Amino acid sequence: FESPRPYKLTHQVVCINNINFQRKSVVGFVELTIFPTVANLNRIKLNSKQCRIYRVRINDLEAAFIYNDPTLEVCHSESKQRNLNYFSNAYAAAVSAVDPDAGNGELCIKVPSELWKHVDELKVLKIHINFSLDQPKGGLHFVVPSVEGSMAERGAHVFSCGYQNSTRFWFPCVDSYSELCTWKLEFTVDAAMVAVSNGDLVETVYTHDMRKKTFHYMLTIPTAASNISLAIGPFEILVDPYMHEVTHFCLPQLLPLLKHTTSYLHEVFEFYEEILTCRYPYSCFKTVFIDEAYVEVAAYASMSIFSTNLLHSAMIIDETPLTRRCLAQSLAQQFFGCFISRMSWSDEWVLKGISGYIYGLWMKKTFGVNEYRHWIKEELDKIVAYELKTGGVLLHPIFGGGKEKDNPASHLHFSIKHPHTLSWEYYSMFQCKAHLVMRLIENRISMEFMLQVFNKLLSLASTASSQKFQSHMWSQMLVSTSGFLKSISNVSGKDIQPLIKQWVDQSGVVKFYGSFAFNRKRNVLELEIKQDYTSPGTQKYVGPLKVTVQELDGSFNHTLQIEENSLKHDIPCHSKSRRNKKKKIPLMNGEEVDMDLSAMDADSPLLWIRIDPDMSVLRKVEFEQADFMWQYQLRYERDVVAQQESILALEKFPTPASRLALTDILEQEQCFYRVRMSACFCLAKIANSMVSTWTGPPAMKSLFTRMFCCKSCPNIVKTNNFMSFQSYFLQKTMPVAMALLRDVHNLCPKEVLTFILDLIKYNDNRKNKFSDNYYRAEMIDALANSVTPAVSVNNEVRTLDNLNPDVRLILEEITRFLNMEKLLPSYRHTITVSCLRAIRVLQKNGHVPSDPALFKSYAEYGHFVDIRIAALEAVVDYTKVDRSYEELQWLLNMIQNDPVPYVRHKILNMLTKNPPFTKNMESPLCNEALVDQLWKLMNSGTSHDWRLRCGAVDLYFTLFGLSRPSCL
């Protein structure tokens, strides 16, 4: 109920002064307003890192001073136990001790006996601390254009990126979450450079009248410390026109892009208060764009601060989802980074649950309810793939309190009490399970009741906010798991604690061997199918659910399930669907019109198997039907789910030409976009199975024929084929799958080759108003998917043929586009990115030799992120297959040394996804000194951020996980 944390707190004041751009430092004094809890509260602890304190003071009494950093290495630097398990446990205990959620110490000012007798008298104090941030080496950012003479004035900006509890790394506070306070914030700014934080513009004129300005932001609304952040330098645009108080801040010469970008935001606020039945529970909303991100999402109080990649300025169609997509997260988590708030790290999951689910609800009623369902399927893709890579993603209420473990999910690392142990794979899947468990709460409970719950939540919170600080009666904004659950059951008490102990408290994905049987195959037994499952490693047994079956033209048959899963079950039987030449359509689903006796229709009154098409249980369903039923489901079904899963099932085995026919038929209607993209890849696989069975044509050329008439298109489709965004994605996708079409003589896509080169010829002028950009990019990736591994039979790597022949043509085109985007550049060098992937795939077939120095020259500093990020993916696979020790050393040195966080994040992420030096396959000899430097980088050089050494934990997970590395 209450915090086990003493010394309640009310108010705090910051005052940044003397912010430097040359030695690049910040000075400031903080004051704190504390009601202590018990006497002898002497060694008062706050916490920070990378903070040289200048002085401490309580009421003109500089009291004592304790300053440790056990967030640094092991107490002995050569603790030879250099494996995972000891380090994980030791680091877990270490940073748990760093947390003040116990009697601890990082900043323990000791109360003097004078002030202790005052505590005996009055437990009300003020705390004044002078301190100075240095060059911030893991807490802040000073984005500086490398000019330093004049453009250091106009061209730089300054802010704070960081994770959840990175307020420590900025200015000293508590365990930064779950301490309800209010703030007055004093900001020493340039008169031009505008600084934006939480709260309100409460006191600012041309301030202090000397040379600069100084801002007062007061947040009266009672929040916690991990919401506070200050972006200094941009330009103001109120992008108000519909809702009058919506505030935006961007770097100069980026401004009118916001004029396209920012809008649709009003519609989102309209949506959110259609949900919540409040107002936007604040004064205003503030948004900062920045060339960097520790995290792309980042969302704080009244303010979302995130990257300048999401502008999508009016012509750049493919960020039509993405921009407002991410804007949705930067509102929803906003509210639950506002008000609802975790009582512990082990209490959060409801927060990200309801936040992500709410913007899922947004994605329903904004665009693509079928793309909504598609998004859910990708969620299951991420979750199933990760918890079959790894162990579970569990949502504890449970501690290992008393030095206990209780962690089967310690397949790598700690989770229970701590954010800063986890992987981004883990933290991402945490959010993904959060979405889907809220969908299960839909599955047991009305959406209207969800509105009821959330309105009660925010009513109690906004009531408990904005007052005189009701003393001892204020922490109702900690709305964590237990009382939330209680409020759910107060709205409707159902058996949702089984829902918890299934999904919240048994992190297991469930496959399904629901084995198809066929009764009423003129069978005495009638319409029966068996239930089956067992598959450990990561299994889970979920029993009582139901089953969704479509008849021929009839009932959605739904059938119960049980535990003790060696089961056989029936179907609520269809009629005697006989004389079905006469029973043409006895009402399939509404007025749908279909006739085929093409299936095994002597005695097949069935059409389709399903378990829970609304995707209730975390599933990976394995079964078998007649292939007719799969293909006919692809003739039509009312689920994108069903359509792409029959897409996968028919990507496995078959090749009739009727399959090809029904595929193409599916591609030419109004059905769905991405359905057709995976249908293209169906044609790719099945026409690759057409080597001896080349029965159909050179495929899909006819699809560009019969679907595309510019001016009836006399044999070639060229021009202006946009504004119909079905066709946009479809033309963007199809030639890639055409470049896959290969039959084994030399895999010979020669017609397709020359055809795609012709596609690259016939590109449009400014008649297309839509910046003919990504179309180029995926035509280039089709050329990258012209993978020709087997030209160099003996030695042909080395300028020998000026290697030949069509490879050279592909080289001509990619050389052209690289120099065009060096000259034109169109939008993020996205073309250049696809080019770099293409050039690496050319090295992976030995045509341009395996040399990294190009990619090395695109991993450099002064390029874009995305260029640099793709070069790093490339050189990671280079060091994977080729055995370059030296560039690996370079890579790790740059993991140490570069200013950008997000490259370090993605280096370590896809380094771990795509490893060299793979465990117990050690030919390139990590044991020599590489384990040593890696152990160092786990210990040293990585106190900048948590997640960098979390990635290093992932490195030692993959590379030599649960053991000595076979050194000594």
Binding site: L254, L257, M315, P825, H829, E860, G862, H863, F864
Partner: peptide, 22 residues
């Protein structure tokens, strides 16, 4: 220098004002 002389990298100071400019 004959067949494929790709331009090397510039890298310059401010990438975003360039790559995000219609």
């Amino acid at each position: 220098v004959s067949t494929f002389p790709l331009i090397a990298a510039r890298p310059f100071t401010i990438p975003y004002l360039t790559a995000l400019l219609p």
